[PDB]
Design a protein around this motif. Sequence first.
Motif, mmCIF file in Angstrom:
data_model
loop_
_atom_site.group_PDB
_atom_site.id
_atom_site.type_symbol
_atom_site.label_atom_id
_atom_site.label_comp_id
_atom_site.label_asym_id
_atom_site.label_seq_id
_atom_site.Cartn_x
_atom_site.Cartn_y
_atom_site.Cartn_z
ATOM 1 N N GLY A 7 0.680 -1.253 -0.129
ATOM 2 C CA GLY A 7 -0.095 0.083 0.208
ATOM 3 C C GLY A 7 0.941 1.205 -0.163
ATOM 4 N N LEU A 8 1.802 1.272 0.853
ATOM 5 C CA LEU A 8 2.610 2.661 0.934
ATOM 6 C C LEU A 8 3.353 2.737 -0.257
ATOM 7 N N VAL A 9 4.096 1.781 -0.808
ATOM 8 C CA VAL A 9 4.942 1.918 -1.943
ATOM 9 C C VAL A 9 4.122 2.190 -3.194
ATOM 10 N N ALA A 10 2.810 1.710 -3.169
ATOM 11 C CA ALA A 10 1.946 1.771 -4.299
ATOM 12 C C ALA A 10 1.358 3.403 -4.236
ATOM 13 N N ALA A 11 0.937 3.907 -2.961
ATOM 14 C CA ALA A 11 0.445 5.234 -3.183
ATOM 15 C C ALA A 11 1.646 6.312 -3.322
ATOM 16 N N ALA A 12 2.777 6.079 -2.862
ATOM 17 C CA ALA A 12 4.130 6.950 -3.022
ATOM 18 C C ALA A 12 4.437 6.804 -4.663
ATOM 19 N N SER A 13 4.317 5.714 -5.331
ATOM 20 C CA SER A 13 4.551 5.660 -6.967
ATOM 21 C C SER A 13 3.414 5.940 -7.847
ATOM 22 N N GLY A 14 2.323 6.429 -7.172
ATOM 23 C CA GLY A 14 0.996 6.529 -7.813
ATOM 24 C C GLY A 14 0.633 5.233 -8.290
ATOM 25 N N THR A 15 -0.635 5.105 -8.814
ATOM 26 C CA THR A 15 -1.322 3.675 -9.345
ATOM 27 C C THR A 15 -1.607 2.894 -7.980
ATOM 28 N N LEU A 16 -2.029 3.353 -7.062
ATOM 29 C CA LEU A 16 -2.620 2.653 -5.689
ATOM 30 C C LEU A 16 -4.083 1.587 -6.261
#
Lengths: 559, 559, 559
Positions: A541-550
């Motif tokens: 969740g964290l590394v997706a939200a920070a990458s965009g595309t959560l």
Amino acid sequence: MKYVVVSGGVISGIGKGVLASSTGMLLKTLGLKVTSIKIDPYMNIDAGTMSPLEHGECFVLDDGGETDLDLGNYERYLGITLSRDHNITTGKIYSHVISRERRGDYLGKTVQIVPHLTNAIQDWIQRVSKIPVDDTGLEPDVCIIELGGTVGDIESAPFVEALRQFQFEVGRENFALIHVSLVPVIHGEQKTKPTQAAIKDLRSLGLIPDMIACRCSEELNRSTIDKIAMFCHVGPEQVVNVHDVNSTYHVPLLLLKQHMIDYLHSRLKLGEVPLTLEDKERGSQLLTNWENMTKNLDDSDDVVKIALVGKYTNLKDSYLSVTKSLEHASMKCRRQLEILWVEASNLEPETQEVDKNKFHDSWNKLSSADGILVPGGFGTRGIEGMILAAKWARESGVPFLGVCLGLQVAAIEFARNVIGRPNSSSTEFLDETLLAPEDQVVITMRLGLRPTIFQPNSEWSNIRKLYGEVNEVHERHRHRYEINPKIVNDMESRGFIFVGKDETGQRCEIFELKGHPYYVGTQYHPEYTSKVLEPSRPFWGLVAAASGTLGEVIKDINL
Amino acid sequence: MKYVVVSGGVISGIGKGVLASSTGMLLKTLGLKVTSIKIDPYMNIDAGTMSPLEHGECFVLDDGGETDLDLGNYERYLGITLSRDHNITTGKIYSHVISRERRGDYLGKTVQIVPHLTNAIQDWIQRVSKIPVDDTGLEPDVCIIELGGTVGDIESAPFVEALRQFQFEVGRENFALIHVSLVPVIHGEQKTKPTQAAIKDLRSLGLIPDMIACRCSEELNRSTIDKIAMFCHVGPEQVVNVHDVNSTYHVPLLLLKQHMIDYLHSRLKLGEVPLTLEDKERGSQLLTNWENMTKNLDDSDDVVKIALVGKYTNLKDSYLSVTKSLEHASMKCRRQLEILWVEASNLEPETQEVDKNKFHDSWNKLSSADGILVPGGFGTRGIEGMILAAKWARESGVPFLGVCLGLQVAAIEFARNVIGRPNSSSTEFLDETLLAPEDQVVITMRLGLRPTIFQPNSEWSNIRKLYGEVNEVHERHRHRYEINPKIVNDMESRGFIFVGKDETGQRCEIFELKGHPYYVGTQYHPEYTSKVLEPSRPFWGLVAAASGTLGEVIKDINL
Amino acid sequence: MKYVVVSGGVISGIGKGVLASSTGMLLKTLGLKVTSIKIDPYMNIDAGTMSPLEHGECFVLDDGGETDLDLGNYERYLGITLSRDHNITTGKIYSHVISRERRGDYLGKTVQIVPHLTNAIQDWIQRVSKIPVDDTGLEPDVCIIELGGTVGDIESAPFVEALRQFQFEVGRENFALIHVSLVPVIHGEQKTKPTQAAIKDLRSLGLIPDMIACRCSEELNRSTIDKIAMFCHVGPEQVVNVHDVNSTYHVPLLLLKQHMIDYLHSRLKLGEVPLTLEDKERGSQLLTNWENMTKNLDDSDDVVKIALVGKYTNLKDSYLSVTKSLEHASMKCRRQLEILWVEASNLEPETQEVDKNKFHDSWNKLSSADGILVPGGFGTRGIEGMILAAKWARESGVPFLGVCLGLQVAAIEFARNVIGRPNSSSTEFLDETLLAPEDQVVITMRLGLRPTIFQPNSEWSNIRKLYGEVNEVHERHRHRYEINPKIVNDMESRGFIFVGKDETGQRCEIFELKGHPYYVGTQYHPEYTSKVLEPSRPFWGLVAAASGTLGEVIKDINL
Ligand SMILES: Nc1ccn([C@@H]2O[C@H](COP(=O)(O)OP(=O)(O)OP(=O)(O)O)[C@@H](O)[C@H]2O)c(=O)n1
Ligand SMILES: Nc1ccn([C@@H]2O[C@H](COP(=O)(O)OP(=O)(O)OP(=O)(O)O)[C@@H](O)[C@H]2O)c(=O)n1
Ligand SMILES: Nc1ccn([C@@H]2O[C@H](COP(=O)(O)OP(=O)(O)OP(=O)(O)O)[C@@H](O)[C@H]2O)c(=O)n1
Ligand SMILES: Nc1ccn([C@@H]2O[C@H](COP(=O)(O)OP(=O)(O)OP(=O)(O)O)[C@@H](O)[C@H]2O)c(=O)n1
Ligand SMILES: Nc1ccn([C@@H]2O[C@H](COP(=O)(O)OP(=O)(O)OP(=O)(O)O)[C@@H](O)[C@H]2O)c(=O)n1
Ligand SMILES: Nc1ccn([C@@H]2O[C@H](COP(=O)(O)OP(=O)(O)OP(=O)(O)O)[C@@H](O)[C@H]2O)c(=O)n1
Ligand SMILES: [Mg+2]
Ligand SMILES: [Mg+2]
Ligand SMILES: [Mg+2]
Ligand SMILES: [Mg+2]
Ligand SMILES: [Mg+2]
Ligand SMILES: [Mg+2]
């Protein structure tokens, strides 16, 4: 049953733990139900007594067994669940047989350390390698034993004897030894005499080596291998080189280019082990997941910067499981990771009175981060910096995960800065003041894998989407202090909603803040359960939200 | 007494259950009081332990006996009521004789499986075939035994021996064997060697076959029959072909074109069985009801689309009794059926975050349906989709039947969306929250045929018109959880009127909503009591309302 | 681990139990820690329900497990102690998996007998062969499985499938099959077609044979072996012949002349099993004890006649353990044995009114005997004959052992004929009379290996000299009824001294009569604990006293 013992070294800092965690991974690609055992020559019973400053973080198992780091490396590489018995120690086995003496079980004989204690080691390894470790209660096909210390020591001594007997008490061709070794380079020449002075000691202490796994600074010369194969009795194809490559997840595939499955398939007759197609095809599929995720690492370029905010960041091994879980989450998002080390006490305004450079560099790193992590710290002395980073993460909309202490500073932040109680406090710190606005309470320890149940309305919560919307979550805990449950009805009204709780309802275990892109507290530790092909859902969740595309990750999970 | 055993197979998936359920139907057209026995080689005592995912739905008998699917096929084809003894299993008979050992009844002899256990089978079949099954307590004239598994197995082995002795312990000419068999087609040629390799094993295990009922992909060639009648000892008239036809209700009439009553009348001397004109004329009238309903299927064209809304719709056998009851109701309305499989979890708005195609296809199928069914699901994980379909069915006026869980989601829907309690909940799911708006309560099991009494004012209720206005209804139940009776006085005020209740008054069993064309909950299971010439009244109600002409069906019932 | 399965037969009476009990003995001469498993195809859970008339005596294990005879043959040949789990039965495994269904452990799947029950067999054999059986808790090296019934049956069927999977679930070269077989002789020609029609079925049911152990009436012709090695795939050296020889204790040495250790050492790679010199030298010493005791049988001539006095003597298998213990005691004394079968009811004077020939033959056999045994009978209907033989044995000075009921008739005899109460009675028989002179009382069952403690003054007792003067004796029990302890103070005064008692003191377990050459009661069963190289001490006492040289045996024990 089969054993591979990973062992040796001229020096103890040589890095055997990758060759263990990576030999067992290669054998799992044959589909074998692999397990692993750590031997640690230290006298500690178990790691719970030794602080994270002193040789890295305090791990947690399903049992609650606070344990050596090196269990974690096998769990995440091999997908296995371990138990506190898988950590053999000089502390444990001597405490065991000496407690067994006062119980009387040697019938009043002498309990010499030869014969009887080396027999207890050989019994313990044979008990432990038959404990089940995968998703079904099937006993292991092969056991990797990592012999801590070095072969040629005084803390190693009962283990190397026990393993000389164990080379026969389990037959040869059910046992193999991999000797890690040092080949220094000086004035441009590869020096194989430290290695040849640990092959002499190995033969002397009585095990016979199979592999000679050199940690040289270079590719080994063809003439260097030819001389190591003249002084050790291995053939030159077996003198594996374990040199540095672009990330440690490549190391299994270097050993696979160096024939190590083809050698171990022969040298342990692994074709005679019974396997189903459900074993074998899971094996060859897992190989392609490892070839895919290493190919994704080889051409992922788009960076994601995660601020890890806490005390003792100069001791990165104090967070080894936190770092490794972000690496899994990174490779699954296909964004390359940078972690920003924010030494939390530098964010506190009093630092401006001591050194402005620290105050600016720390707030610069925090402001630069695409996502923020409060990583389940220990003690209390950096807490105000961890509160300021939680204020920043709430108001500036930046993605946030609080682990353990991280959930707790998030409640303290929210109390001081949204509910409006500026005297509200960590009862973990400001205790004998006896104030009424206590954000926490002591409830004397709580450890191991525990059941977290989602609260009823939780459907909208991104954290519940990341857990596949399943009603219960099984994850590993450590906490003396927990959120004071008499504040929860206020936070539940103000949009800080406790997505997940203990089975009694009385203890709060997950929250998600309404109306923010991703802002989560988890009071369990999500780090320890992450595997290299199954990143821990809050960290994904964290590394997706920070990458965009959560949102696109939430499809990859739920499809 | 007479027996026909239906048996055999090169392969176990070959479909013996139609030839059993269809041989017994043909014999019932002679007016004989036919009964049937299922043998299942599995070790389960009774089906209540095995989930509907694992080889289809959990049936219910008058006893409460949770049983094999194949009992249901005979009940609905033959009009009979069965008992949990009619399901012989390897579990039952071995649990029986091994429990009888600890009771001592073999006088301390050896209890070899030859002689003594095969004698218990031959005793059980002779007990069971004398239990009455029709509307009067008259003992059966003929018993159809369906031998599950195959003849030539290790789970079949005591049954095929028991039936070799039973070919004599009941005289020949009171016993006949029908061997179902496989005749593959490859490169355009009919291959009768799998069949000839199961006639060898049949003779070996000691029964002698009478019929050779091939499941070929085709009509059997005259030369194929001539060779099967050369290698099996049957005459070529007896090599029946059981190929596919426009619906399984035609299969009896194919066997009747293939002389099978004229053969069984000879081969069991059925002219020597005593029959009244009340037997014989009921026999020849039932034949004309079967010729009429199959002629009605042959030229019924006007479709009716029924949405079946629930979890696991890819496992259609998890609903076999639900499907079959709609087919009876269809043929009685003279509308051709399409059932729309709505995988309920796809109706939930969170699906739009995972896959929009699923969210649209499921709401498209639901919106296209002429009538809606909530089919007595199991577990809880699809419940919000089943609530949305109940909201849709109430507000959009579409015809609705809720079976078991279907009545319960209808009360939950009505509470959330008409009474206005949005937190009201299935106590079957959201239990340890301990909330006050509980739409259900646990009251530890309740099974079998039970009496439902209509509440006094009920005269206007379409469901009471469909039950012929009779004051009591006898139907089969399963439920742990029932409607919380402390909400009923509110629903009774809001037009959700509980048409029918348990004899104590305290338990609610039917409702009909005032001022809707047809909207019914039944907390018993109406599926199981439907017969091919007597469709279950709530299901006849649904398929009539969806066809139009619900009023004309109410005349066909009450005249 | 290694397995040898002993199996097969055209006919079930063929005598596999010697080849099992004798293959395992030969492997124990290599020093291997051998164990054994019996498979019995009967439905009995355990033998306690089936009377000694119905296929022989009711055995007893250390657990109290009343069990199949064939456990006893391995215990006495192999020196091992078994447990009630070592008797696999169709009763047990079907009661196990069917009880496991109601417990739910197959997760509500079907419990087909293929896959799941054959998996429970393969699990049970792998549990049981790891239970320790020798004087130390070391797990077995090799397990002998005796497959009861025949390969080619319907009670055998799950076992032969389970063992086809078990040929792989344990690797080949850890498994071997020995097929016992029939080679009839007719008109002077050896007929190997019954054997060739059980090798066809063996290959079909899927095991592959290693040995072909013929039970011919003769030596097999070299041409007979050559044809069996043409139709079975074994080489002609492997077609062992198991013909009759001067006693069954020779059978291992015939198999040793027929290369069977040299073949099994190769075919299971037994050189790869780890052995100590304490294993190997015990192995080769035990071989010389077997060569010595068989050489002693080959030229022992001096007879000893022991009267075995009891009911049902025409059913000699009702006493198989009693007979075998006298054979061990015989060979240890170096006197050849004759046992005199005294059908006890014939000694009763009323027999003189029915047939005088029976009255004379029985008293003739009793008078001719050099020693007398009352062999722990069952029921009560012969008891007066067993009392008269105890009167005779006391007054005529003849050596005497009473086992179980034998101790009890000795107390009844002594009460009626020395204490002078002629109405004194077996409370086991004459119960509802309610008389005061009760020699026994019910105390509802007592089974298994129990501790017997010697009473303090016991030093002079020949029975205590035979037990090596050790203060406690561990032996196997069965009795509902025990001596009434309120008579003991009288018997203790009259010279009938209770040498041994239960640990509470309240129960009487051994007596020896003062001033007689050897007159003993034991209320435990001394038969079951005798081994072929360690005869049971009371039975060694009897056959020594009857041979003369009871004193010389007491030196052979105590040196
Ligand atoms: N698969 C692996 C194995 C090890 N490490 C790194 O290796 C470390 C410690 O070294 P290790 O290889 O575990 O061995 P040593 O600590 O040198 O100890 P020893 O040689 O005594 O086993 C940690 O920093 C960890 O990040 C890693 O990143 N990935
Ligand atoms: N076990 C050994 C190895 C080498 N030599 C001798 O020692 C000399 C110097 O050792 P070196 O040539 O350096 O051998 P290496 O083993 O390569 O040492 P290094 O790896 O450190 O270069 C050699 O020429 C050889 O004659 C020896 O006596 N004993
Ligand atoms: N009169 C019948 C009989 C069977 N079926 C269908 O047949 C199914 C299962 O096959 P069946 O004929 O009952 O036999 P098998 O399941 O193949 O099993 P077996 O051959 O072992 O009896 C169900 O899908 C059911 O819809 C049916 O529709 N009508
Ligand atoms: N029980 C039998 C049947 C046939 N054959 C021989 O096997 C040959 C090949 O078998 P096939 O002709 O295929 O006979 P079918 O029984 O029809 O086999 P299938 O039904 O598979 O075509 C025949 O010509 C015949 O000589 C045989 O030996 N034994
Ligand atoms: N070492 C042995 C083995 C068997 N027997 C004798 O063999 C008997 C019964 O036959 P056995 O060989 O045990 O086998 P069966 O009873 O024929 O049964 P099965 O063939 O089914 O195993 C008993 O009378 C027993 O005295 C013996 O004396 N010594
Ligand atoms: N499996 C076999 C064995 C033999 N034969 C034939 O059958 C004839 C008669 O059988 P026989 O000669 O008695 O063979 P055996 O196997 O020795 O039979 P037995 O042991 O009973 O003497 C033999 O000449 C041979 O041609 C056969 O058809 N199939
Ligand atoms: Mg150091
Ligand atoms: Mg390490
Ligand atoms: Mg199948
Ligand atoms: Mg079926
Ligand atoms: Mg017999
Ligand atoms: Mg036997």
